[PDB]
Design a protein around this ligand. Structure first.
Ligand SMILES: COc1ccc(C(=O)Cc2c(Cl)cncc2Cl)c(OCC(=O)NCc2ccccc2)c1OC
Ligand SMILES: COc1ccc(C(=O)Cc2c(Cl)cncc2Cl)c(OCC(=O)NCc2ccccc2)c1OC
Ligand SMILES: COc1ccc(C(=O)Cc2c(Cl)cncc2Cl)c(OCC(=O)NCc2ccccc2)c1OC
Ligand SMILES: COc1ccc(C(=O)Cc2c(Cl)cncc2Cl)c(OCC(=O)NCc2ccccc2)c1OC
Ligand SMILES: [Mg+2]
Ligand SMILES: [Mg+2]
Ligand SMILES: [Mg+2]
Ligand SMILES: [Mg+2]
Ligand SMILES: [Zn+2]
Ligand SMILES: [Zn+2]
Ligand SMILES: [Zn+2]
Ligand SMILES: [Zn+2]
Lengths: 322, 333, 330, 330
């Protein structure tokens, strides 16, 4: 049964692919709806249930089924991971229900309508998307537009019983969160959070500090694959690489320079994963674990066990460093 | 999970708390308080794993059992059974009884609570005796209903897919069966005096952090009295709930009086709507029956049952604020 | 010390006001008022010397009766603080000027000063000096205002000493219009006017209340403090139950006075034939809910969590029931 | 204090034995045995002085090697508590006497005492004095018993002082029969006998297994402790993985010593060419699953959830795969 798998909704390491299969490819709808009930978000913001389901299905339908990694399973995973991260004891009673909703809704839409290729592929091919967004956070800008645009379809406005101020406030937060998922923003985000860990009171008594924690939270949820039970992590690696190698096949067909990690004929899958952890995932997830000491120690330890597992198996690093 | 199912699940989180809103749960479940509460308590206590009880079999039995409580009966219906089930579930987890009872003894107390008033017709044993009912004739005027409640609770195990005990060994089943019988037959009010006197004697010479109970007589004594305490637990509930229980039992009692009047029978204690004092009857019920029982219990599990005993005396005072045959009656138990 | 940690809840509906009264040494109105004024920076804004404030607040509080069980300095503190929370309601963000805000809180602090613990009609029946001065019309409410303003003239008490004449004359007007609305005989007409406002309701582009003339701005401020006054049945049940126990003791003393004197006993003042729980349900059904129902719709959906408790507490009192003509004809 | 809360789970499969070892101050065998003796009333039944029991348990436990990653006191404790759970399975209710229970529990407790963390073959090929003493046959298993019984002779350590000669001679025969059956070279015939018993299984009138001869009775107790000994994979994955890490560390220490000495490296002992997950899968497919499948048959349906976990945990090891001649041979 599906229902019995959803009981793990509050735990790190939910059987997410299992839920994907059991709900008939509706992991984003079933998990988002569970969490909305679990958090009493339908009562608080008077979201009609039919309106919520209809929107969620709509949002899910706009994730591509042929995209290996950035599809509805990835989106459900980031939504659920943010739901767990919100519930850490060191952030207890820190966020309002509007900020809670924002981080969770921002996580839901954060990759909607992904074509399975990078911003630069879109930029180099003179895509209509890159032309509209002036080669700047092309997809991340797009994910937001599509996610907000989708509220306008029949019976999809889930924010209809929010006041003007609540919609303004929510809208600003969702934008600041999803635009922080752009990787060219990782270095400054980690730095800003590095500073907060050093001068913290936990209390956050202005918008700039509050959006900043919420930004990094969803960012860690986005970069959380390596911190998961290994049998799930392994599945995230098979999926991203399948997507990456496809862009490489596409770049190669077109006579383009093949991107970092996209060459199936020259792929150090294992070495790239240690590089992802060493350069990006671990440096961030360690700074999070400081902010919320010791709430993520087992998450941090799972990360180091996976890195060691991937190391043992070793029979783009320029890109990781920058 | 529907929107009503979620609100019901939100109510069900209080299953471990005295004064659960059992009437809201009755409404929210589509009049299935006993199925939902029993199912919850079996999950919580891992009784399905422990006794390898198939889940479909457990739900099919629960519904079937609840279907044999009479909807038209005002007190001794399925909301009452669920209340005694839940109240026992709480009393079992009381700090001073921690790790005292085996898995089978726990199943026995809970199953006994569920079945203990099944198929109650709304009338006393004496009404059934005086009318020469077949029930009385079968059970020789002795614990007529209490025998019936048991007979029926065990009978329904034989319906299709209803045997929740199918994977117990003969030893396990013979033990459980004997404990359920000891517990339900203890709910007959003609047993109140001995049950309490023996409990008083236990408290007197009681060994202990948690209570030490070594032989069968003493363990069955505590279990019988615990369920007897859940059975007599209305006055110890928040006033909002206790008042509902009173209206319900008085509506039941009054129906029996009207039947007794119709038939030119003598009207039973507390069943006369043209001459009843609801409040006065409650003070008697507490002073003579419920308080001396809950006082003793609170001694046994001290100081776990302190708020409970305090609610009891607050409620007695409130019924005192608002104020013969029935005092004679209550005095002799 | 201990007080300081309770006073952090001054922006919340349900402040432990009775404990604050204990910890401050029977000085709740002074501390809660001083707290609210610093919180709203009303001293810097209006050039109020902090010693002049505290002296006046001490003076005002002293003129609340320590022997009156309900209408004392704890009730005033409670009305001040409930107005303070009601002024921060989202649907009213940036609506009211600092002067209009000072007016609301001032009015609430003074609204019951020198209350003798008996009704207008007791004063009127007995030919009291007060009823003869105010011509039997809003006797106590006129007095509360008059005392509240005359204490400004005691030593080092004039908190408005640095207000301009236009500010002073405008503040005075608003404070008067507010407190005179607390006479329960103005309730029927106050609600009618608040109702007609919800049916012809204008809202700013930011979503908040659009009030552009004086009649409507005062109207809202009148009902707000009127809601703060009748805010007991909407607080946590532990607070509410204490307010009922206090109002009745004070009602009962009035009845004892009326019996002694051969006077007809006022509704709810007979200790020998009393229905405390059922009169609470009547208070809620006929007066409080209908008022808070129309406030909720005025600030929709801000006042939902408060309306839910008023309906919760009505149920707790309803369940404990073993003067209606009075409640009806308002 | 936090220890009492963990020892509540002593009757339960999946007890947090590592957490109990940290909380007792590296005394899992002493606390766990003591708990079980208190819960089974064994001290009363056999007039075992309580100080004698503790001194013995501290002594026995002191003789498990601390520097050994798997075959240490934690493993001894784990096998004791697992047998204790298995003895209580509903399908064996009232089958075994008190002295047979005492025998299985004591046997579990002593079964790896003074284990040096290397195999018999290693002790044989290096001509150890222990191999010489035991003529290369069940070298370690003979030693664990000799030490286990030898320690009864230390000061205040004779837990069997108040047992009659008949009882002592009977307990001793049983303990020896049980521990010597923990030699893997006996696995095949022990299992073959369990299967036989399952095929010609008799239940009593009250639904528990019938065993009217010593050969049948000791078979079951041998297989029970054999099951407890091979129970790691049937534990919560979180417990199982610590067991797997600890054994492989122990195996890998021996491989390093064999390499150092120019010896052939034993199966699963080369840290440079290891398949930690493929080994657990094979360990389950060849040894653990055939054993527990047959046990779960004997005690049907008592061990269904134990068997289900086994089957979940195998699949987890398949998923983490990026020796077999040895496994199959047994
Ligand atoms: C589990 O395996 C992985 C999962 C996700 C990523 C991402 O970078 C995802 C992801 C995200 Cl969060 C945001 N912009 C694009 C993508 Cl492609 C990933 O990438 C490794 C890696 O080194 N990532 C850095 C990076 C920077 C700029 C563009 C693209 C990538 C993984 O390792 C192969
Ligand atoms: C809160 O209101 C009540 C709830 C339950 C009872 C019972 O006695 C229930 C109940 C139970 Cl436990 C067991 N045998 C029958 C019933 Cl009828 C009750 O009765 C008061 C009272 O005085 N009961 C004594 C009595 C003795 C023998 C037969 C019947 C009754 C209540 O007060 C009127
Ligand atoms: C918590 O319980 C109460 C709290 C306050 C009141 C008041 O009405 C106070 C209050 C106020 Cl606001 C204004 N003029 C006088 C008083 Cl006495 C109250 O009174 C109930 C009630 O029915 N009041 C209606 C009324 C009062 C006076 C004149 C005309 C009409 C309460 O119930 C017993
Ligand atoms: C959690 O994982 C394990 C746990 C226990 C064993 C044992 O075999 C233990 C153990 C036991 Cl019961 C009895 N004689 C020695 C040991 Cl070394 C184990 O060994 C693998 C395995 O396949 N075992 C077979 C075997 C036969 C003969 C001698 C040694 C081993 C594990 O897998 C690596
Ligand atoms: Mg993205
Ligand atoms: Mg009965
Ligand atoms: Mg007044
Ligand atoms: Mg061994
Ligand atoms: Zn993403
Ligand atoms: Zn009953
Ligand atoms: Zn007032
Ligand atoms: Zn062993």
């Amino acid at each position: 049964v599906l229902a019995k798998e959803l009981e793990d909704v509050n735990k790190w390491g939910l059987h997410v692919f299992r839920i994907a299969e059991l709900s008939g490819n509706r992991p984003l709808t079933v998990i988002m709806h569970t969490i909305f009930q679990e958090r009493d978000l339908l009562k608080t913001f008077k979201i009609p249930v039919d309106t919520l389901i209809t929107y969620l299905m709509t949002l899910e339908d706009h994730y591509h089924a042929d995209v290996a990694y950035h599809n509805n399973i990835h989106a459900a995973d980031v939504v659920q991971s943010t739901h767990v991260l919100l519930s850490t004891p060191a952030l207890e009673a820190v966020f309002t229900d509007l900020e809670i909703l924002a981080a969770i809704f921002a996580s839901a839409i954060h990759d909607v309508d992904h074509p399975g290729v990078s911003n630069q592929f879109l930029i180099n091919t003179n895509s209509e998307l890159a032309l509209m967004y002036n080669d700047s956070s092309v997809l991340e800008n797009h994910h937001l537009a599509v996610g907000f645009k989708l509220l306008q379809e029949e019976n999809c406005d889930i924010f209809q019983n929010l006041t003007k101020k609540q919609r303004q406030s929510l809208r600003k937060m969702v934008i600041d969160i999803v635009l922080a998922t752009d990787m060219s923003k990782h270095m400054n985000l980690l730095a800003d959070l590095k500073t907060m860990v050093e001068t913290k009171k936990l209390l956050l008594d202005n918008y700039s500090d509050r959006i900043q924690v919420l930004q990094n939270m969803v960012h860690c949820a986005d970069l959380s694959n390596p911190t998961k039970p290994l049998q799930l992590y392994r599945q995230w690696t098979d999926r991203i690489m399948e997507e990456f190698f496809r862009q490489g096949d596409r770049e190669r067909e077109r006579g383009m320079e093949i991107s970092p990690m996209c060459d199936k004929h020259n792929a150090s899958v294992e070495k790239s994963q240690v590089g992802f952890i060493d350069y990006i995932v671990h440096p961030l997830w360690e700074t999070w674990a400081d902010l919320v000491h010791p709430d993520a120690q087992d998450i941090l330890d799972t990360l180091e066990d996976n890195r060691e597992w991937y190391q043992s198996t070793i029979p783009t690093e320029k890109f990781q460093f920058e």
